Amino acid sequence: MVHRFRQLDAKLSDLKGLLKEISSKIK
């Protein structure tokens, strides 16, 4: 499953990047 959980972290990283981008947008 380590192979497969590995897939999960990519979604979290992309979501964090988008969150930072939108935070820059508002401010």
Place this chain on the structure above:
Amino acid sequence: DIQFGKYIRLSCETLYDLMTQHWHLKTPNLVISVTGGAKNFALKPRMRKIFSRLIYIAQSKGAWIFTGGTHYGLMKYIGEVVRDNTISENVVAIGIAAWGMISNRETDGSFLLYCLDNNHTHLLLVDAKVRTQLEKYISERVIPESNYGGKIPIVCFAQGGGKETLKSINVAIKSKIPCVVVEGSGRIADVIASLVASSCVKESLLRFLPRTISRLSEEETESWIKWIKEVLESPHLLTVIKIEEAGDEIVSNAISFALYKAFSTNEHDRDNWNGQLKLLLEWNQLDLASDEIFTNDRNWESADLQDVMFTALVKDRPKFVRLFLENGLNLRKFLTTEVLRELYTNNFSSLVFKNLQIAKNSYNDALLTFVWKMVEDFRRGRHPLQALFIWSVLQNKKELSKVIWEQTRGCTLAALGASKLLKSMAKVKNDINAAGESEELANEYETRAVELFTECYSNDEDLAEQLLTYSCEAWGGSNCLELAVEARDQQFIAQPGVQNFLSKQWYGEISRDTKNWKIIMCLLYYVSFFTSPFVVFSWNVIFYIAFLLLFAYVLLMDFQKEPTALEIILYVLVFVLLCDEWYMNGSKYFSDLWNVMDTLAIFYFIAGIVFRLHSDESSWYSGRVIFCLDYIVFTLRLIHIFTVSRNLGPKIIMLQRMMIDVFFFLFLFAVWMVAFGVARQGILRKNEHRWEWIFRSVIYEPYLAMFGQYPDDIDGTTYNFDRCTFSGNESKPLCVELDANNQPRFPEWITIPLVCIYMLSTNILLVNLLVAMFGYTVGSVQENNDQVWKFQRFFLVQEYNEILAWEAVMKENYLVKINTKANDSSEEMVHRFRQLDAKLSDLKGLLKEISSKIK
């Protein structure tokens, strides 16, 4: 005093002066349960575990414990645990109680609205502030022999919240070094744990303690929120035992972390790092110390560390030893004559000293005397690393022994020597657990050496043998292989590499595994063939067989009155064999059975010669008989000779395991023989006055009965009077008792069933049972017999700079492999999911920050 105990009963520092001298000694540490005991407390298993571990730690460190002592809830259990531990440094449980809640009050008085806890050793009466003042004074107390920079470090434990608990927490926080600790579960402790805004505080307080708040007035709850704000101002003093945690030694970790944080935040002890390191050394905290101190590479040159290092060696903290070595430390330079002298003179247990005495006196060995004289030389006032390893292993320090062994250059040799030392110490047995641990550690070191040698042989087969042949280099009298032999290391010698080396040596210069029969047929180029042990053994076997043939010919065909020259040659050959055995006399000649047997044979031969030379018929006949008896031993020596067959040796060795079964068989057989023979002889014969015939008819005939012979004088029809004699003036058995009519008198219906039963028991049942036992025995011990034969093969065969660096490289690779081996499996994911929650927490924090930004 009190009966169920001194009670000062003072009103609201001076008490401490009297306490120190009159009653008990000073405290390296102190612990306080600030939270009071509710009328009803939830004593779930986790609380019980936490407080039992806390009490055990207090006993280990020897600290006072402060509690109310009302005999309700938590304090009841703490007192019970304290009493049980003290009965089985010492723990002291001082208690304080106000006269308001005491039901019965009397002025050596005895005691029957709270009831005082019985388990508390001491109690104080007041006509809570006194507790705070006493804690403040004890904190302010200055002692020079303190690793905490003085101040007598104090830790306060909180289990359940409340008004009194919050007041106590606040007053303690106002004073410095409170070191408050709050557990996960509690009426108000959960609030504090969750917090680490008025609206959020109100929400947490309501959800965690809903009912009590409604009773409280608005102003009072506002004041409580102010108190909680004051507590929340400084989070470094607060420490929380999170609920999710379920590991061991949680209490010790929490206490150590809180005390370390308090010491670090002093703002004047921050510059000093030795104190922090010593504090983290007292408590088993490796990761925290490594992260805080050694990682930064701030202010230490690694030269002073020696001091701290010494303490670890005496306090059994192997992980800190490894940490010091990794971060830079020359053990060779640190180890000096003075350091070793201090280590051996004082820190060395005298029990091991007398045990060394007894071990040396009981048995003498080269390495035992070497280590003995080394330790005496150190005590009275050269490979010091070996001395440190010996000191560590002797005291049975498992982990530190391995850590030290990792540094020795003679890895396998050191392991074998340690195993031999442990076995020799275990020989001297006085405690079961001590001997068990000694033998277990010796076996572990043996297995480690076997693995290391497997790697050595795999990497380089040709030169791995040089390690076995390589000498000690001052390590000890013997080398690796001899050291393994002395400790009876069947596992080590039974591995493929050592057996292959032994075979290659025994075959000699002859090319190995050419063909067995070619070498026999063959019986400078010739010198190499003629100097091999195989050929020498073949020649000796041939000579012995020829000697047996000559002995038989002289004994049977040509044995005249006067010694003939051929018999003189026989004498010369036997004395030549005696001279050959003179060489082996140097070793434990009487230890083994075959050696004593050969000495016996030689003695019998010389006695037979003495009879031979008398020249009298009755004397030289007895000499011939002596020679005949000696021939049996001389021939039976072939069984010992042929233990190297590789096909017969294991089977021959197996015979040693059948002795118990043979003894049981013989015991039953002898009992039955005696019973049956006595019964029959008494039944069918009168008084016998010839001793020989008693045993000839009681023992001999039943013994023959198992070989298919059937008794004849048991049936009247079969019985024949020709063999027997009425009187004793003859050499044949006495006749059966007769009657007035001159006929046999025995009933004949008693003897026949008896004989049938005896024959059934002996001929059939017993032998089949023996066969079954032999089958089970050969099945059970088949594998161990191979190891035993391989071990004896060493004796049977022996009867007739760059390498150091390469060993270091191989050992370094092996150590790197084994250290990371646990991480190689990586079958645990909890470790790894743990990583996920950090991202979610950071994302939630950023989300809250951006939400604050917009609003």
Place this chain on the structure above:
Amino acid sequence: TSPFVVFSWNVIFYIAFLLLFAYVLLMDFQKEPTALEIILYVLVFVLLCDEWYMNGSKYFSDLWNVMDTLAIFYFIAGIVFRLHSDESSWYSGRVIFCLDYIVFTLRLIHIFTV
């Protein structure tokens, strides 16, 4: 006072008793009881007294106990035949003693279970 030593003494005494019984049975068995046979009777009754102590427990529960009672009964019956002073009677008494000797010897199997 160790049980090991007491057991060793009892085993030695039992072996000596067996030797004495065999000697009386084979070499010296005369018409009129001899003092040596009287000593043998005394020893057997001493063993009976010793078993009286173990009688308190489940004496008939185990096989060896009933076997020893049977042996004692056979011995006393053989005595009764022995004292009649008739050839046909004391010969049967000798046969009885011979049969009893088998049980007395076979008790060693039970004795050596430790």
Place this chain on the structure above:
Amino acid sequence: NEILAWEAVMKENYLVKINTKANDSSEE
């Protein structure tokens, strides 16, 4: 008396060990 208390202590330790034994594995 002392033996009884020592037995109680050992039994308490054993009970605490066994009760939390199922949680020790934590294979779920």
